Structure formats: structure tokens, C-alpha cells
């Protein structure tokens, strides 16, 4: 019969089996992190064989039916999403030198020692502690020389075989290739390109420029008091004194630049120990939430399956917090919850994950994913920001019911979220320019690292304290270069966090600044989330975004009306100091 | 009407449920097991209010008047399903199990039971004991069994008997485990026809029959069907206990 029917039959037979395969898989691998031992991961290595050998399979069945025959739209998008052939075009040789390539990487990166003084926590504190100069710049050109100088010819066999491998499956270069998934094609007013996500981030950064000038101006000058003699009023921040290895967020610069340290930040530790949670009604409280905004429950398996504690001396477990959709109706959490308020924000946040898997659990297989790579992650942080507002412990018995609030513990908190918000997206789009280039060709293999440093002074505001010759490759250090993996997904995560909280704050008719706002006891923007999540990746993002914002296209607009009141008192301190950074000075 | 007299046949067999209701193992849904149950006063009062039923829909009939009747036969279908296919045996609908596994007419006129058994029939590692069909060439006439395994062809060339491309196997097995979603745990199914003819009736409702009167205005009732008039020794109904014609005259 005609070539939709078939491909329809051949769908029908592959969820069915795929969705088996996947259940079996999911739970070695959930056995094996609640409960590690010596057999439990050769369940979980067989598993994870069998699951892939059965996929591959699948595609190479998948490549007879024509892509152009099929008008379904949906059909289609589960044949495209299958017929992905990857890197199997390599030859075998080339192949098997990729994986060494990427295992050699992983294992030099993973085991990294300066001496003894490992990356953690050994050099993680010294870097965050030391407030000492030397230290902290010994250590960062530590780091440097032994894990950066080795990783250099890995590096660049790396980007050779990748790149070729991308060319060979119809792509321009690798960089092309992650970017294509912000693609849809085929949808009238709703279509967008590979060569459209180049810019229209250029764009929204040229939007913020000014607000991370005033916030960079303002760090150097709190921050010249001390370190009194390395710093200049007009320049760059050294790199090594950014409270981190790499500089990717500037959280533990906070202690040093406290806009009124008077007032005591919200903290309701003392507050759970009191009354004595029990680490179970953490969760409680985080199904109310939901369920005042007009989600629905939690499943029955959900509380006796799933572990929420520490399990013990005798069984050991790794236990970094984890929401897990197994399939087949199986939901679980992996968490070690103790009473704090980090504790109690991360639980809403996982339950948030749990609540984005619930909604399109009806759709096929191959359809069950957030519509792009930023979507899912925003959707979980969102109900942080709700569940963080002062109004909403006031209404729970845990903060006092007579609290008073004072703009000063405003200013506070929205610096200390504006240092890690706004103080990252530099760095990810400088990172993540830098990568397209070099993929690209753009950049010659004698010019990486003067170009890599010139867009550190000229894009981010940093300088480098001693020089780097074409022997250290630096940007291999951080983990996601070296152990591959994408990273404009953390700087389209902000946007889309701050799009979703205006349309959800404005859609339940709240009155004042945004930073205050809360979405509890209002069933309406619950509807309208609700509305975006059963969709999965069946529409286009582009759809699923004009659901809850009404706008096709991100917009940096609803960051920046966030930060406003910090913007205006920003503007007020700096006044007086200059403002801006000169390229020409360094440190030597 | 001075008096009221009611004759059903007198029946004191207590009626196999116990023997549908409570069994073993139940067939599966592409081949399920019908039983056929007549001489027997069946109690639907205790089948009703047992209460341990997640579904129990009657179509067509009161379910409390069905305890008091008299059906000429009954037939009780058993089979395992998934929790969320429940809602497709019913009429008029449509899906995987519906079209290809149990189909029911549109003039149903019985009673559908569906409880929870994830006690007895999953366990872990998966039971892949229960099968159901997933392709076939038609659909499925109101109760149609069919148990050939034949390979389906989707594409234009045959294949002789042998899995491959264009060619895959009908039945596909259900797996079950404890750790499952509501959704998709097992559910037990029976459901019960009840079929009228002219024949005489033989399954009936539990009620006490009493002597029989003439040449006075009594109403009566046999079997189920109810009525005001004079009865005469011989518009004419047959009583079961004796087989005797009789005439209703109007008073
Ligand atoms: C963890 O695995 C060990 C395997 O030696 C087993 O003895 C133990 O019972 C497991 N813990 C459970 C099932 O809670
Ligand atoms: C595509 O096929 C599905 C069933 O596989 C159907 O529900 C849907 O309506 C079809 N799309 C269009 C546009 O007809
Ligand atoms: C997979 O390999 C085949 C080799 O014949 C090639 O035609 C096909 O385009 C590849 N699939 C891709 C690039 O998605
Ligand atoms: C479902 O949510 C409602 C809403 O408050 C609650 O009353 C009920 O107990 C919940 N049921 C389950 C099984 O979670
Ligand atoms: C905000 O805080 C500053 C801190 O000095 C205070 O002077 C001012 O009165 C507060 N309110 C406004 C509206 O500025
Ligand atoms: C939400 O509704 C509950 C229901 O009584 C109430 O206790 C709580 O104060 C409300 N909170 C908000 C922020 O409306
Ligand atoms: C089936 O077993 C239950 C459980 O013991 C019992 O109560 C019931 O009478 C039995 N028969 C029927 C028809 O349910
Ligand atoms: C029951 O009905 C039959 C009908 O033929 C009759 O012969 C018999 O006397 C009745 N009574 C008993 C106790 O069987
Ligand atoms: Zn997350």
C-alpha cells in the first residue's frame, strides 16, 4: 500500500517494544544508583547494550521508507527524529579513534592532580576560600598547566573528526549540527533556521549590555578595597578573582559585596528545625502548591517507590537530586532531603520536573520530550522563583506572621540573584562564539588562544594575570568542552524563565513588582501552563511558545523589568566611577 | 385485584458464580473463555454489593430490577486487560482491543465488571503470559473470536511465513510488573449477556412462588411479565409449574 500507511504500521510496532526496552533499562539504572554494588552494574551495562543495539536496529530499518512521502506531520517528525544515522558514517577506524579520543578526555579530566590536591574539593576551595592573591592565581595556573597543556592535540583531532563526521550527514560543520535543533520546518508562520539562532542572540545581548556594565563597574569597586594593589579603576577584573575556577558565576563574590550587610537575609532553617519536619513534608507542601495552582496530584507509586532520604550506613547510594520518568506510569525522585531551605527550594523545583513528565505521558514515544532543550529546565525553575517569594512562607507557619519588609532586604535579594542570573550569560555566549568559530573555520590552529583572550577582554571584561602561548588550551578545562556537550541551552534558559514568570504573573492579575510576585491559589495560569505542557514536541516551539507568552521569538524585555529597581540603584551608586573597561591593560 | 399471585419455576440450584467469578487463571483478551449458565436462580443483590468491583455498568437493564427476572440463558466472558482499555469494553467504541480483540453490539443488554488484579497476576521481572492482538486485517464483527497467529502483511510482497521487513508477527504480549503505573496495571473483566427468546426461561430471580387462583380479579406475574385479569381455566399465558394454558379476561 502506499508509503504513510506502512511508515503508520511500522510506528505502531516500534513504540510497542521500544517503550518495553526503555522501561527494563531505566530500572537497572534506578537500581544501581539507589543501591551501588559489584552486580548491580552489570544488570545495568547488559541493559544499556540491549537498548542500544535494539535502537540501532530500529534506524537502520527505518532508513527504507522516502521522507518525502509522508504528509502527516507527525509521522513525519517520529521518522525524522529515528532516521538520525549520526556518527555511524565514520569508518570503523575513524570510529574507534573518536571513542578514544572522547574516553582519553574524560579520563585525564576526570583524574587531574596539580601536586595530592585534586579539582575537588581540593582546588574548589582554595578557589572559593583563599582571599589571598597569590594563592588563588597559583592555583588557577596550576590547573591550567596540568590539565589545558595536555589536552591541546586531543583537542584538535577532536575537532577535525567531528567536524568531517557533521559534513558527512548533510550539515555544514558541527556547530551547524547543534544548532539544529532549534529548527522547524514545514509550518507556514511558524518555520525558523539553523542560521536564524546566529543571530537573534547577538541581538538580545546587545539588549543587556548595559546592565552588566553597571553591575560589572560595580563589582570592581567594591571589590578595589580589597586586593588593594592589583586592581585598576579603569581595566578588566582579573580573571582568577571571580569566586570561581573558570568565572561561570559570581555567587562567592557575594560575601565581599554586600549592599546593606546590616539586614540579615530570609532564612527559615531555625524555623523548619522547630517545628521539626520530617523531611517527608517537604514533598507534602510541594503537592499542596501544585494543587492550589491547579495541577493535578501525585500518582500512588509515586511516595512508595521512590526514596526521599539517605538510605543508610549499610546501603550506600548516590543521591545528587533527580527526577526519574521510567515509563509505563512510573515516576520517582532521588533526593537526600535534610531541613533547610535549599532543600525545600530544590524539592519544588524536582516536583516540577515530575509535573512537566505527567503532561504528555499521552503521547507517542518518540514525542515525549520538552519542545527544545530550554524549555524543560525553565519550567522547573519557575516554580522556584514562586515558591521563594516572602508572601508565600508568610502563608505557610514557618516564617513569622508578623514580618516586616524593608527595601533594603529588596535590594539585597535581588543582587545576590542578579550575581548568578545576569552575572553568567557573558560567559556562556562568549564560550559558546568562541566554539561556533573555531567549528566553523573561522579561527587558524595558530590563532586559538590570542583570539580566545581577546573576546574574554572584549566581550566579557576579563583579563588573563600571566600570558598563555598556543601550547595551553584553556577552554578545555571546563567539563562541557572537553566531555562534549552543548551550552546555549543555559543562556536561553534565563529568557525563557523570565518570559514564562510576566505571562504567568500577568495572567493571574498580580499588581506591582514582579520579584514579589506569586502564583498560587490561581487556577487560571495553571490552565495556561497546563496547555503548553501536554503539547510534548509534537508543535514547533515556536507554538508552544506563543501559548503562554503570545510572542513567536524570545525577548529579553521581561529580564530586564525583573531587574529594574536594581538597575535604577545601580545607576545611582555609579554615578560617580567610571563606568566601561579599556582593553589595552593587563596585569603584567 | 383482591389478591396477588406470582409463579416462576421452581429452581433451589444455587448458580455457578462462584466458579467464573473466582478462577485460577483468567484467558486472555484475543482468545477469551465464555461459560454458559442456565438451571440456576441467580442473586444479583450480592453480586452488586460486594463492592470490591471498580466497574460495574449495566446496559440496557435496571440494575436492581435485574435481580428480579427471568432470562432464557446467560453467558459470562472473562479476560485480563490493561486498567486504561476498561473504558473500551463498552458499546459503540473504538481501539486496539475493541476493533481487533471483543467486540460488543450496539443493542448490548447485559452487564460489564471490571476489578483491579495486580495482586495476583504481575510480578517482577514482567508476566508475559497474557498476549493480545495488535494487527490485523478487519475489524472484528460483535463477538468474533479469532486465534490464528498467521503472519501479517503490510507491505506488497509476500513473505512466506517468516519476520522481516513489511512482515510482522500479530500477537503482542503484555507486560506486567508490580511497579506499574494505575494506568497500566492488569484488570480483570467478565461480562455477562443475558439472551430472551420464546423458549421457556430457566435462569430466574430469587422469589417465593405462591398457589395459583381463578374466576377472581388478582394481578399476576409470570415470569417477569405482569398483568390485571381474571384468570380462566382454557391474551392466554402459560404457567411453568404445570404447563396449563390460561385465559386473562379483563375485569
Ligand atoms: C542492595 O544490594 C545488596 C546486594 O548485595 C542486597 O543484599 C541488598 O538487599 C540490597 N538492598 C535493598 C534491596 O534494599
Ligand atoms: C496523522 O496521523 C494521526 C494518526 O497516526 C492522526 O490522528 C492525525 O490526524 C494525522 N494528521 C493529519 C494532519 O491528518
Ligand atoms: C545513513 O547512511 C546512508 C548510507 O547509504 C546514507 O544514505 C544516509 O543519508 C545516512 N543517514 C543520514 C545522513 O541521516
Ligand atoms: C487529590 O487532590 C485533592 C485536592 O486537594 C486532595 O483532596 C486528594 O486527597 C488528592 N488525592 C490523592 C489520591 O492524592
Ligand atoms: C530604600 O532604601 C534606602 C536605603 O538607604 C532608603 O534611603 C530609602 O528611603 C528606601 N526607600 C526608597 C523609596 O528609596
Ligand atoms: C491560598 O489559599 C489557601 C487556602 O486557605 C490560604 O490558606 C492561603 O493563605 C492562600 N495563599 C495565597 C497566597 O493566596
Ligand atoms: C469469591 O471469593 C470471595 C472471597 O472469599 C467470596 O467472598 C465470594 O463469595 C466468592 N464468590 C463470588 C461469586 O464472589
Ligand atoms: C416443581 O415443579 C415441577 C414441574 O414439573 C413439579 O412436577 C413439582 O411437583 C414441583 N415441586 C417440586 C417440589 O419439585
Ligand atoms: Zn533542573
Known sequence: STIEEQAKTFLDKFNHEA????????????????????????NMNNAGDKWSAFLKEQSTLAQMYPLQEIQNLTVKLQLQALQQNGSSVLSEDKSKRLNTILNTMSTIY??????????????????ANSLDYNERLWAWESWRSEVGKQLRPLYEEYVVLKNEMARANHYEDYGDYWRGDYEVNGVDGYDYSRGQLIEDVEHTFEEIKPLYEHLHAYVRAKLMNAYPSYISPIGCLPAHLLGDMWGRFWTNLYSLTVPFGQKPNIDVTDAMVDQAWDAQRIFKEAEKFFVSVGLPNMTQGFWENSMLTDPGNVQKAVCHPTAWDLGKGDFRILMCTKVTMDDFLTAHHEMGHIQYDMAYAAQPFLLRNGANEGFHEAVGEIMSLSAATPKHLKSIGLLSPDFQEDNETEINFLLKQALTIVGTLPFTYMLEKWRWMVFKGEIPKDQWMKKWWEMKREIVGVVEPVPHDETYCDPASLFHVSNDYSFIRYYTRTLYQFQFQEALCQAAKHEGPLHKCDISNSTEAGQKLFNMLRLGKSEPWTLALENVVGAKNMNVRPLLNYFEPLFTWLKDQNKNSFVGWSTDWSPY | PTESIVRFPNITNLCPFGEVFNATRFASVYAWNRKRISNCVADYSVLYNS?????FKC?????????????????????????????????????KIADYNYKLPDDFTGCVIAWNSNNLDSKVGGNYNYLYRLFRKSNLKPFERDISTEIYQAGSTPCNGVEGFNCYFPLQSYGFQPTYGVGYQPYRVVVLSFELLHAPATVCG????????????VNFNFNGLTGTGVLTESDAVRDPQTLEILDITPC
Open chain 1, 19 to 42: 517503550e518495553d526496552l526503555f522501561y527494563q533499562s531505566s530500572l537497572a539504572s534506578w537500581n544501581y544508583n539507589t543501591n551501588i554494588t559489584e552486580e548491580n552494574v552489570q
Open chain 1, 110 to 127: 576526570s583524574t587531574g592532580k596539580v601536586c595530592c590536591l585534586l579539582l575537588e574539593p581540593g582546588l574548589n576551595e582554595i578557589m
Open chain 2, 51 to 55: 463492592a470490591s468491583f471498580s466497574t
Open chain 2, 59 to 95: 446496559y440496557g437493564v435496571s440494575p436492581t430490577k435485574l435481580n428480579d427476572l427471568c432470562f432464557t440463558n446467560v453467558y459470562a466472558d472473562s479476560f485480563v486487560i490493561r486498567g486504561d482499555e476498561v473504558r473500551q469494553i463498552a458499546p459503540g467504541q473504538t481501539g
Open chain 2, 206 to 217: 430469587p422469589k417465593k412462588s405462591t398457589n395459583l387462583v381463578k374466576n377472581k380479579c
